[PDB]
């Protein structure tokens, strides 16, 4: 009992990472679904009565570095709900069915503290299609996650289960069933990239104009949001290099950084992402 | 908890291998990036405020024997930090999900003793693209390394994660994303080879001049730094051998050694290295 | 700890196989390198100070049956140092990363007993070029052998790592790098064959002269040292067959044995051996 | 005792037999194995014994656990919804007494129906499994499911699964009516739209529900429950952005929502049905 | 382990019989002729086509040895658990070192040792390598053990292991006197009207048969009269001719070309 709550006391996070819905760039559709599944039931609870029930599972997928965990931080700031962030380190115990007793205790805590959010980051490492896996970890952790999410005597009222992944095709079909809105988070388009440069330079003194950010956003097709965060990181180091080899941010610093920094995602990973989106998925816009 | 920190207490190295920034030859770019990611945040911490954050991951790759682990020893001498040095022997365990509370409490050790450095030597043996690997080792050690490096509730402030590899194309794309400056350590060039002969002869009495070292450096195109360390080893063991067949050093001693000693690298390995550098990488100069 | 030392207690050999340097015929280069890497640091330790360090890895290769393991027995008799004759039976175990702790525990034992010699016989069965191998055995045993041989916090002082192989082209290039003197042990020439007949007849009463052994050595071109050990075995077993089939040794006994006994090796294996010697190797003389 | 009596539920999820759409053979077998022994107990005397094991199988999301909830409402039994979390233990010789206790309290509470949901997680062919959990559980369970003549009141062992081909052949033997719950056809889909809109004010007619049911071939009952969920959200989009239910709301939802089962999973389901079912 | 099997029991090929009587009996009956440079043989590879009495000759050495005998084989050393197929080998040689003299009979060595150009990493390199190092090696002391081994595919054997087996003897298809002896043995003490010229006739009739085939024509010919009992006597030569017409051997006359190839190159 209390030994186990002594273990899982270190999962109720208590610091509210200050990412707001405008610190996310792009993604109208994913913010829209997440708002009407997280913000709106709490703010107007009289609406959800009768047949109109809130959503109880949302899967975000995409290529690496495009906004999934970050949008989860935005939910963690704006939700006003208890935000459990669990992972595979915290469920696999050593001891014959604690990896089922821990899961069952997790959702029991998230029912006694409703409204709650459970964010299982990289769900593809728990849930691996069960055709090659081992007996215990495979059948018993996957099976207790299944039965615990909808089941018979279980009552998934007021809990939401997020989840992010990069390999959405290696996911078991029963767990593809449980996540009832598979939203796809793509590489950013032109307006999103321009927005991310304008955000990531912050309040740093620069001589750049709107057509300069527009120029860079035109220059960077193929980059995810991580890559643009690191070209802004490197370009913000350029005044120090000046001030040792001897100020303002001036556009040759950014052109210097963009010449040096190279994309991170290739172009067949995108084919299997588009495959899954065309066979099972939403479109995150 | 403390059982696991009792295991990983023997990874924080404490003997400080006395290699200084002089003792590396060539590689101005890699020393430059490592200095402005390790030395400079500590020495002038007032600068790095606002949007200007230090680098939190550097991958060094290259052919075998060109300077990677040695440059890590140079960081270990010059850094003034709590240099850990961990490897795959020290993270994988026997009892079912102990092999990732090790990963977690490694990074929690580096957070309790910041500013810290984590040097994961040969990272392609932990992190193997997870499409063919086994459940426990693969998904759970790779996944806890991912979530622990950036994640949601994790705060990678003030830790730096190094890493070296020889097979940089067999690395998972999420972990290619986490290492945000992939620097390439190449085979040497003329001035570097001349510098390595001048270093490796040390303070040994020799009749050689600058044009002699210049001659040998012109003679040895294709050799890595290991090979020049062993031709200096053999040439320093020539006069003992003449004591046995019966002095200072002739250039015929070095020509003798260079005739006998034969390089390590070949010339299609270089094609795949140049491939990765042209698709994702920096240039170590 | 003590479970693992209970495993590796059966590697410190304790019987000193009485093979002396005179018994090993031919091959003065390989004896020369092995003496100046094994005998000479112990006998005159004042010499090796400053930049002059002893050799810390020697690979012997060749065709099957030419002297490699035997020369290792000669080192094991003449060395006066702690000798571990480890093999693949003593490094692989079943329990998920308990093989690596035997490798690490082997070198961590060897630096308690310094000076030491580690003789890994048939290193081509541990180290298999890692392009087709499996995840665990491949990346983790090869990787722990690499990092453990030179690494960062590891200090290969006073240990020597021998190693023999018959397939030297199937060896990983990082481990070709670690073995810093690849010596080649070839098929014997005329004087060596004559020496091997004179040794293997021992002190057995024979009517043979120097021109008789010279005759047989001229007769046997193509034979390795195994084959000449078995023609001397069979020729010594002729007289017992002249007691059952019904004395003294005359050259018809050896001609009888050489007619009956047929060789082992094949003349394209030698082409790939000479290939590797011309691309990466020393010459064992 | 007080560790397995968290298998008895008591809240009675109010699903009645006129909420599952279609599946008439399955309702027929479940009625003549659950309702009929209690209502006319004089009939089952002599050679005529009730059924003592029923396996439901099918693709994911087609009605298995839901039909088990319907039994849990309509049965008037005592209902143990046990699972693998509640039977396995660290201490050796606890995964013997736990199963044994389960069936003994089922005979405390006759009539009993016991719903071992997802039986492939208890019973895993025992060639690779660990000593404690796999062997003594599956052998003790085989014994206690060999109560043929004594279990004439009480235990009816249901069970649902999605992977019916990964089931041990002795346990395929114990479940003596393997019924297959398939993806639903036209009248069932039309019925599910009419149920899931509930009493919500809509302008739709019978030919509108008939139209949508014609539109959705390939969907299971989960998918139609979520297109009705999303289409019922559509008014609040027309209030936030800045009303009645239209048919453009449902066409909007059906464009956005994409099916769940893949058409090779059905090949292995049909395989097992043709070989054992 | 000594049930009956004898040097008297076997038919033909006294070269094999004398090489082995030498390599086991000549040290054991006399351990004082082998001193100095004169050491006994420590490995013998028998081969041949099937049916030719290899493993039976091995168990003749088991009875006729006064030595321990471990009849392990390739079926019993395959595993699939990461270095279990080596500790079996090593502990086998541990009980053979502790129990001098010993004989290790590895039946069908061609299933362990498969030329290593196409094989997999672990099983190829690790079972072959532990067999190599364990047979002579450095700290290993192959005193008093003899490693036998039989095979039907002797050309698919690795050249280092062809080197370790230092007397590759070839067991061929047998002659006339051996076949006549095998009929006389296999009829046992069963009442038959046959004479020496009858067994001589059958032995002339059966050229191409191995010892298995003659054991089964004697099996079938012994079950002819009971067959005429219960689906309705004595033992005639027409019973054996009947059986030999019905029963057919295994072999092909190009398999013999590759056997003779290996014998002419290494054997």
């Amino acid at each position: 009992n209390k030994k186990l709550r002594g273990a899982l006391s270190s999962a109720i996070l208590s610091e509210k990472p200050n990412v707001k819905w405008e610190d996310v760039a792009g993604l109208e559709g994913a913010k829209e679904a997440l708002k009407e599944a997280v913000i709106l039931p709490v703010k107007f609870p009289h609406l959800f009565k009768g047949n109109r029930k809130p959503t109880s599972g949302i899967l975000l997928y995409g290529p690496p570095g495009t906004g999934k965990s970050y949008l989860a931080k935005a939910v963690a700031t704006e939700a006003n709900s208890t935000f459990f962030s669990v992972s595979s380190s915290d469920l696999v115990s050593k001891w014959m069915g604690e990896s089922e007793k821990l899961v069952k205790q997790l959702f029991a805590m998230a029912r006694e503290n409703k409204p709650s959010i459970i964010f299982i980051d990289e769900v593809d490492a728990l849930t691996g299609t069960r055709g090659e896996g081992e007996s215990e970890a495979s059948r018993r952790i996957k099976t207790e996650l299944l039965v615990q999410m909808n089941g018979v005597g279980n009552d998934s009222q007021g809990v939401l289960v997020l989840g992010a992944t990069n390999i959405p095709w290696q996911l078991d079909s029963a767990i593809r069933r449980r996540f009832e809105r598979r939203i796809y988070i793509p590489l950013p388009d032109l307006a999103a990239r321009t927005t991310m440069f304008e955000i990531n330079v912050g309040d740093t003194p620069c001589v750049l104009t709107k057509e300069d950010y527009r120029t860079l956003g035109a220059m960077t097709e193929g980059y995810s949001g991580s890559d643009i965060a690191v070209v802004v990181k490197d370009a913000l180091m350029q005044p120090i290099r000046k001030i040792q080899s001897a100020p303002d941010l001036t556009i040759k610093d950014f052109l210097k950084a963009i010449k040096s920094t190279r994309p991170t995602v290739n172009e067949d990973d995108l084919l299997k992402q588009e495959q899954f989106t065309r066979d099972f998925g939403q479109e995150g816009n | 908890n403390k059982k696991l920190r009792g295991a990983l207490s023997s990874a924080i190295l404490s003997e400080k291998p006395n290699v200084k920034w002089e003792d590396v030859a060539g590689l101005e770019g890699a020393k430059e990036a490592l200095k402005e990611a390790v030395i400079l945040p500590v020495k002038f911490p007032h600068l790095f405020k606002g949007n200007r954050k230090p680098t939190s991951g550097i991958l060094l790759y290259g052919p075998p024997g060109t300077g990677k682990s040695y440059l890590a020893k140079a960081v270990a001498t010059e850094a003034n930090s709590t240099f850990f040095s961990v490897s795959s022997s020290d993270l994988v365990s026997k009892w079912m999900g102990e092999s990732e509370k090790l990963v977690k409490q490694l990074f929690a050790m580096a957070r309790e003793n910041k500013p810290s450095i984590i040097f994961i030597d040969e990272v392609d043996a932990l992190t193997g693209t997870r499409g063919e690997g086994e459940s426990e080792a693969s998904r759970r050690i790779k996944t806890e390394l991912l979530v622990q490096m950036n994640g949601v509730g994790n705060d990678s402030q003030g830790v730096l994660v190094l890493g070296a590899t020889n097979i940089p194309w067999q690395l998972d794309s999420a972990i290619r994303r986490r290492f945000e400056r992939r620097i390439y350590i190449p085979l040497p060039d003329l001035a570097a080879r001349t510098t390595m002969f001048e270093i490796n002869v040390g303070d040994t009495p020799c009749v050689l001049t600058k044009e002699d070292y210049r001659t040998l450096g012109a003679m040895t195109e294709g050799y890595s730094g290991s090979d020049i360390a062993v031709v200096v080893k053999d040439a320093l063991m020539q006069p003992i051998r003449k004591i046995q067949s019966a002095p200072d050093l002739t250039i015929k001693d070095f020509l003798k050694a260079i005739k006998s000693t034969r390089p390590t690298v070949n010339e299609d390995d270089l094609l795949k290295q140049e491939q990765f550098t042209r698709d994702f990488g920096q240039e170590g100069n | 700890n003590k479970k693992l030392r209970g495993a590796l207690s059966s590697a410190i050999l304790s019987e000193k196989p009485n093979v002396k340097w005179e018994d090993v015929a031919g091959l003065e280069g390989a004896k020369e390198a092995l003496k100046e890497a094994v005998i000479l640091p112990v006998k005159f330790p004042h010499l090796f100070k400053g930049n002059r360090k002893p050799t810390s890895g020697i690979l012997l290769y060749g065709p099957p049956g030419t002297g490699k393991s035997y020369l290792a027995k000669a080192v094991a008799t003449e060395a006066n140092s702690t000798f571990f004759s480890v093999s693949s039976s003593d490094l692989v175990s079943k329990w998920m990363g308990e093989s690596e702790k035997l490798v690490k525990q082997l070198f961590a034992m060897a630096r308690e007993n310094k000076p030491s010699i580690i003789f890994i016989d048939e290193v081509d069965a541990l180290t298999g070029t890692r392009g087709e191998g499996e995840s665990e055995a491949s990346r983790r045993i090869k990787t722990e052998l690499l990092v453990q041989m030179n690494g960062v916090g590891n200090d290969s002082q006073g240990v020597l790592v021998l190693g023999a192989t018959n397939i030297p082209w199937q060896l990983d290039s990082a481990i070709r790098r670690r073995f810093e003197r690849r010596i080649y042990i070839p098929l014997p020439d005329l004087a060596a064959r004559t020496t091997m007949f004179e040794i293997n007849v021992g002190d057995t009463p024979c009517v043979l002269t120097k021109e008789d052994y010279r005759t047989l050595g001229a007769m046997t071109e193509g034979y390795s040292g195994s084959d000449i050990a078995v023609v001397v075995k069979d020729a010594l077993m002729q007289p017992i067959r002249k007691i059952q089939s019904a004395p003294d040794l005359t050259i018809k006994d050896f001609l009888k044995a050489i007619k009956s006994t047929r060789p082992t090796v094949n003349e394209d294996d030698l082409l790939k051996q000479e290939q590797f010697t011309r691309d990466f190797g020393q010459e064992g003389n | 005792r007080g560790a397995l009596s968290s298998a008895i539920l008591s809240e009675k999820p109010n699903v009645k037999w006129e909420d599952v759409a279609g599946l008439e053979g399955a309702k027929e077998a479940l009625k003549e194995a659950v309702i009929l022994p209690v209502k006319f107990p004089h009939l089952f005397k002599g050679n005529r014994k009730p059924t003592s094991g029923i396996l439901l199988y099918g693709p994911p999301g087609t009605g298995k656990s839901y039909l088990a909830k319907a039994v849990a409402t309509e049965a008037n039994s005592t209902f143990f919804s046990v699972s693998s979390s509640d039977l396995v233990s660290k201490w050796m010789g606890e995964s013997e007494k736990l199963v044994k206790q389960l069936f003994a309290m089922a005979r405390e509470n006759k009539p009993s129906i016991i719903f071992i949901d997802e039986v492939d997680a208890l019973t895993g062919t025992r060639g690779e499994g660990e000593s404690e959990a796999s062997r003594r559980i599956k052998t003790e369970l085989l014994v206690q499911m060999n109560g043929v003549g004594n279990d004439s009141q009480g235990v009816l062992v249901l069970g649902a699964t999605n992977i019916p081909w990964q089931l041990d052949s002795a346990i395929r033997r114990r479940f003596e009516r393997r019924i297959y719950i398939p993806l639903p056809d036209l009248a069932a889909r039309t019925t599910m739209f009419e149920i899931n809109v509930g009493d919500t004010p809509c302008v739709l007619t019978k030919e509108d529900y008939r139209t949508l049911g014609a539109m959705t071939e390939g969907y299971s009952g989960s998918d139609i429950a979520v297109v009705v969920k999303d289409a019922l959200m559509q008014p609040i989009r027309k209030i936030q952005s800045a009303p009645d239910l239209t048919i453009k709301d449902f066409l909007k939802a059906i464009k956005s929502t994409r099916p769940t089962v893949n058409e090779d999973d059905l090949l292995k389901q049909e395989q097992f049905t043709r070989d054992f079912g | 382990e000594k049930p009956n099997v004898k040097w008297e029991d076997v038919a033909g090929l006294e070269g094999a019989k004398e090489a082995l009587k030498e390599a086991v009996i000549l040290p054991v009956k006399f351990p004082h002729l082998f001193k100095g440079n004169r050491k006994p043989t420590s490995g013998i590879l028998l081969y041949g086509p099937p049916g030719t009495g290899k493993s039976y000759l091995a168990k003749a050495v088991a009875t006729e040895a006064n030595s321990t005998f471990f009849s392990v084989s390739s079926s019993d050393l395959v595993s699939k658990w990461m270095g279990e197929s080596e500790k079996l080998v090593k502990q086998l040689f541990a009980m053979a070192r502790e129990n001098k003299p010993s004989i290790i009979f590895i039946d069908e060595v061609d299933a362990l040792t498969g030329t290593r150009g196409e094989g997999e990493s672990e099983a190829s390199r690790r079972i072959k390598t532990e067999l190599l190092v364990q047979m002579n090696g450095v700290g290993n002391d192959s005193q008093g053990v003899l490693v036998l081994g039989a095979t039907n595919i002797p050309w698919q054997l690795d050249s280092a292991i062809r080197r370790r087996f230092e007397r590759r003897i070839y067991i061929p298809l047998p002659d006339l006197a051996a076949r006549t002896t095998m009929f006389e043995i296999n009829v046992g003490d069963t009442p038959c009207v046959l004479t020496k010229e009858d067994y001589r006739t059958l032995g002339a009739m059966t050229e191409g048969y191995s010892g298995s085939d003659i054991a089964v024509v004697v099996k079938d010919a012994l079950m002819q009269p009971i067959r005429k009992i219960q689906s309705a006597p004595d033992l005639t030569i027409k019973d054996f001719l009947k059986a030999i017409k019905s029963t057919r051997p295994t072999v092909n006359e190009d398999d013999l070309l590759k056997q003779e190839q290996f014998t002419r190159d290494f054997g």
């Binding site: 050593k94 014959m96 | 026997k94 009892w95 079912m96 | - | 201490w91 050796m92 000593s131 | 990461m82």
Partner: peptide, 8 residues
Amino acid sequence: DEIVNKVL
């Protein structure tokens, strides 16, 4: 208590 190990 009967703990689980893990194999290769």
